[PDB]
Each structure stands twice: as C-alpha cells, then as structure tokens.
Write a protein that binds this ligand. Sequence first.
Ligand code: ZN
Ligand code: ZN
Lengths: 766, 97
Amino acid sequence: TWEVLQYKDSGEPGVLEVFVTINGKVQNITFHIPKTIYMKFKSQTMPLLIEKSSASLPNQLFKITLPESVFLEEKENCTSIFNDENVLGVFEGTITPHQRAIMDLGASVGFEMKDLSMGFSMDIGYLLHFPEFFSLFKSWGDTITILVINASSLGQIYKQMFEKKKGKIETYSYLVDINFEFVYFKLYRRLSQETTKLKEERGLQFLLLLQSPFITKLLGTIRLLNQMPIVKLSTLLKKLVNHVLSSGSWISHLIKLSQYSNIPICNLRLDSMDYIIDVLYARKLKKENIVLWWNEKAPLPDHGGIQNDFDLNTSWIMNDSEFPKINNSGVYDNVVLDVGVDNLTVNTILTSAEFVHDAFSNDALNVLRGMLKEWWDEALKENSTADLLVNSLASWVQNPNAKLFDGLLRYHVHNLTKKALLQLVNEFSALGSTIVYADRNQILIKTNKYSPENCYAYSQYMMKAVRTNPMFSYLDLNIKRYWDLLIWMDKFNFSGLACTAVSQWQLKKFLSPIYQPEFEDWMMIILDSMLKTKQSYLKLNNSLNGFSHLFSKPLMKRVKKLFKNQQEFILDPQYEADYVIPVLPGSHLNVKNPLLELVKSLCHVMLLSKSTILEIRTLRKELLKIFELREFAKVAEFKDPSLSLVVPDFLCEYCFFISDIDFCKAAPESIFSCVRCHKAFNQVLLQEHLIQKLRSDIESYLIQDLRCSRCHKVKRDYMSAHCPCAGAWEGTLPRESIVQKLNVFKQVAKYYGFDILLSCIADLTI
Amino acid sequence: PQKVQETRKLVKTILDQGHLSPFLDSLRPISWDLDHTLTLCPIPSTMVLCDTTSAQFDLTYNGCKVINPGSFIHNRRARYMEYVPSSKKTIQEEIYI
Ligand SMILES: [Zn+2]
Ligand SMILES: [Zn+2]
C-alpha cells in the first residue's frame, strides 16, 4: 500500500502493525522489517545476513541484518557472534522496528519491508482528560461525555466561544466541524464502554485525539482499546471548550507538519519539535552514510557499550556551560546602544568553518549545517513549519531527550557560540565602539558619540555594517534601547536616562528598610547632577568633572542628621523594625551599621565614575569621618552583598529563549517567569535544574585534578604524597568554595520554599 | 563453558583484588572519604554481587560465597534468588512471563 497514517510494533518481534490509506479508506496492515545492526572488530570473522561495510563512526566494521525474531533467539540465548569474539560493540541495535520504518518509509510509502519503498477528509474522535474529567467528543455526533451550573455554563460558554471563533472554525470545518448536548458522570469501566461503542460505530475510518498537558497517557492506553489509530498529544470548563473548538486548527497544523516532514500523523508529537528534527537529521545522516548514534532507551548517545562508563572528558563536556560574559562597569556620558541579539546558535551553525577527541564528528556537523541551510531557505520562502523548526533548533542541540542527543554535539555548538560572541564583540570594537557588557542574548556598546538625536542614523549604520559581514549574516541585531547617560556595575545594578530615567539595584535590597527610600532618592539626585553636568559641559562645547559639587554638602548634612537619628532610634522598639537588615537569597555577609551600609553603597556607585575618582574619593573620606572610620579601614570597604547563584542555559520553551538566570541577583519575577515573553516557569522543573547544578558541583569537586601548591603543575600520578618540587598537593576547586556554594543553595532553598531542593540538601548531611 | 570461565574470571578478580572497584577513579570516580566501604579486606562471608550483564551464578571462592541474581526480567522469565543463611545454599527461582 502507498500511504501511511500510523506505525506501531506488534507483540511478536520485528513485526509492525500499520495503518495505511488508499482508495479513500483507512486499512490495517502488517509489515515484517529486519533489524539492521553494525558491529566492529579488530580481527576478521564471518561464520554465518552479514556484510563488510564502511561508514563514519561517532567520535573492521560489518553491517548485519536479521529478522528480530532470530536475532532475539540468538543474541541472549546462544553462544554466537553476538557474544565476545573481539566485538568492540554493536552500534544501531537500539532502534525500535517502527522507529526504523518511520525513517526509511515515511508517510509516502504479512508484507516484507524488502519490497516496500519511499486530502485528509475523514472522521475525528476525542478523549481529553483533565484530572476526574475524562472528556469525550466525535466529529459525527451530538453530545459530549464528561466523567465525574454545569449544563447551563457549558451551553452558554460553547455559544460564546463558538461566536468568538466562527471564522477559525469555519475555515477548518471540513477537517473537524457546533452545538451538542452533554452528560456528567468502577466508574472507569465507562471509558472502555465508550471506546468500545465508538469502535462498534467505526471499526476504521475515524481518528482519535487523545490527551492534553495534564496527561495520564499510559493509564489512558490501559483503559482505552489499544487497537485504535491514535494521535497522542500532551467552574474552569472554558479550557475544555476551547480545546474542543481548537481541534480543527490542530489537525490542520498536524497535516502541515506531516506533509512537510514526511512523518505519519499518529506518530509525531506537536509537544516536541525536537523529535521531528531527530527523524529528519537521522534520514540525512544515513543517506550520507554515517553510523547512527540514535538511542531509544537512554539520553546518552549510543556509541555502543562505551557510553555506560564514566569519562573525564565526557563529564567535563556534560557539566560545563558558562559564557565568559564581559562586564566593563563605569559611568558612560556617551550614548550607549542596548543591542539585543538572537539566532546566534543558528548563525554559528551556518557560519561554522583523530587529533581532537571531544570535537563532534565533522561529517555529522556538515550534514547539520547543510540541513539547516535547507530549513533556513524554506523559512525564507515562508514554510511556517520550517521557521518553527529553525526556531526550535536551539532546544534540540541541548535537549537530552532528543533521540540523537550527543554531549559532544551540545558542547561543540556551545563553544562555537562562545567564540562567535567574542568575534561579534571584536567586530563592534573594530568599528571604533567599546563594549560595556556582553552575553549570549545582549550587548551594551559605548558609541563614541554624545546625543541620541545625532545617532539614530549612525546606530543603524553600525548594526548594518556588522550584519553585512558574512560571519554574522543571520543575527537578529536589534537596538532595543538608547541610553543617554548610563551608570552600570552589572545587569542587576544600573541606572540611566533612556531615549525617561530608570533605576534598578539589587544593592538597594540589602539596605535596611528605612534607608531603601533614601538610596533611591539619592540615586535620582546623582543622576540629575550628572545630567546637569553633561549638558553644562556640552554648552561649554569625562564631561562629568565636578558633578559631586552640585549635591555634596547637602548629602553630608543629610547623613549627619541620619546618623543622629540612628543613634536615637536603632535600639528603639518603636523603630527597630525599619533598621532590621533583610535576609535574602545570596545574602553574603553580616553588617552592624545599616547607615554605613547605605553610605558604602552610595560611595561605591559614585566610585564607578572613572574620570572623576578624586572628588568622589575625597567625599567618601569626609563622609566616613562622620563615623570616625578611617578612609581605608576594611569595615568601610565595599564588597557586593549578593552572592550569585546562576543556573546556565535555562530554556523557556514558550519562546525558545536560552537564559542564564541568577537566583540571588535576579528579581523574583525574573526567576519565576520568562523575560522575553512572560510565561511562568514550572516550580518542580526549576528545582530539578537547581538540583542538577548542585550535584554537578559536588561531582565536579570529587572528580577534580589536584595541583601543586607552588609550581602549579597538575598531579599526573595516582600515589605521590607531594610534588617533586617539594610542594604539597592542593585542589583546583578548594573545599571552601564548595562549602560556600552549598551555603547559597541552602539559603535559596529556604527563601523560595523549594521543598525538593531542601530535601536534597538535607539528605546530603543526614 | 564460556559462561563459567568468565564468571570465575569475574569473582576471582574481585576477591583476589580485594576491592569492589579495581578501576582508576578516572574510569570510576569514588567519594574519597568512603573508599573504605568498597574495600573488602576481611573478605565477606557472602556477597550478593549483582551484575546485569553476566549469567546467574552462586560460586564459592576462599570460603566467600558470591551470588549474582542477574537481570530481573530476562528471556520472558522473571527471576529471583533465595539465599538460605543458616545453610548457605542458594535456590534460584523463576516465573514465566
Ligand atoms: Zn519566554
Ligand atoms: Zn610542584
């Protein structure tokens, strides 16, 4: 037969049941498929179908082909070529039969696979369950069944949503068409009763839409008659009615995905574009004759048995991710461009280009590049599915659940991304500008220019001059803000005037409550003074020279008064609540004088002004005189109150955004929700990522190399007591730093109420 | 038989080597404090050396009785092992499924 709607494996080995379409009708049919396998030796043997072969391995090779029955009846049942005899290891043996068929047959295809080779218009059914509320529907019936106000709200909510979605329904009415009755319910026997009644009304010629993100999928297949062809999918009844009326657009989108990807409708998942990318990449890899590292059973890339073992390169590859993000703090009287960036992963994969043993295979990378060029061209021609694919590639290169996931691939892509971000910085600086900040999503650039109204032409020139270089052909360079004047120490602690004044300071959050308003007020005064001085200098014509003189004496008067008030009231139960220093994530250190903490913060912000250090320094002295603190006393030195706890490369799937998020320096809204869209993140997912980071650091401590404490050589041997240069061995990750990391983890867990991470921390000790 | 020879090679390696992980830490990292728990120096009286990739067995070597119950579900049979401490017998057991 010459078109497919579903594959699924029979109970017996090597046999598929298949659902095919011809002459209008769906038909059930059955295919017999061999298991292709590769084996490797460093000696010849050929006792037995077996064939000598050649194909690139992942970083003497024979192809082998059996029906799965005899393979199973030999491999773990008989002394055979599958046992010992210098096998360096099987490779593709994990690929399930239907997952082989989906690659080599597609949709545009008992019956032997040896002779098989490479307008929907039918009925739909529906079963979405919202855990008690198993909900049922047919595209050829007039009532909806729900398991255990109801009727009234259902009828009018249907009418309302139907009115809201008339054209959207009508344009897909022929796929799925509308008013209906309803009924609301040991009770799980009804599900088998309903599904059997459906089968009796339609033995074939109808398609079943299963479930939605509150999944119970496997138990669903237990209650459901397993023999249907099924599209698997992963007073608040508005949700349900909206899904019902969404159905036709879903079928349209799925048909578009299938017709593009050449994948049957039942097998692909809307929930993971990574799987579509997997099957398509697998097709091109085998068509370019690469031995395929597809893994069905585990995340790890199936290199044969060797992926079971620990390896120091592999563990470094898996553990490591952090960009060498640049942060040049200072005051900037120049205009600063807030350059947003996107498509850096896509751009670098496109613009990319043993002796090297953790590089991903150059052949497979070439296939990924050429295939991404193919997808990109089809996105330029507005294949919406191809654009959705290219946007989703950043997930697939990182997602361990991808069938062709490889740690070396993730790392090869990652460090290429790093190198290209540095080359982008090199280009911007080569154009005479200077970089305030840079990471994988953003660059802030000093312009060597003084007014935004002069620069709206020059900025677009600059951005175009970058993107016209071939190295950056595909970047989404976007001037997201214009800063007239910028005070900057990190991306959680800055203020400036934009073209209108904004101020955000994690520094502020660690001051006691009575002084937090005071800090903001003086920040506005400092910005106003810097502005007045900038424009004053520009009317006379580093422009900041003398800006302290517009407010210094008022500031010292104010601080004398506040010091008197603190001596009056810090002890007082009437006022002590506003002098309590807050407990916070990454709360670095203790402090005994909160006014001194405010003054330290204000002086530190002003000491960012590289041109003017002397006037701020003298003002800092005369302020610290108020406390009888010496100018260089360690009590008066500024150390950042926030200890960063960054989770690298966190993914917002709703907009495919790859952000490092800092649980201490970020504001809580930027932790619990995205910062390009504003969808919220799942709490258990987030705790899981923190546990992955915690265990990554414990492992990274335990697997570390030791280093000689005076000549800094690495300890190359297993049983020396000290280095041959007489120096003792010391860790490259000293224990103190790891205790500090665990301390910030316990603080973060206590504050945000992360129960699972807290249990993990507790189970380390106890 | 190949199975006997390889399992004898396994247990004889482990007990002569006296230590459950003879491999370098670069091939199997150990928490440095707890390496004393992998060592066997007064050889145990019995060892349930469960290994997913060898035949079931109940060898004796230097008086140490070493039993591998193997994979739970193998060749359409569920498998489990009944060690009798007061006689050191080892009755293997199975269920077809
Ligand atoms: Zn988002
Ligand atoms: Zn040394």
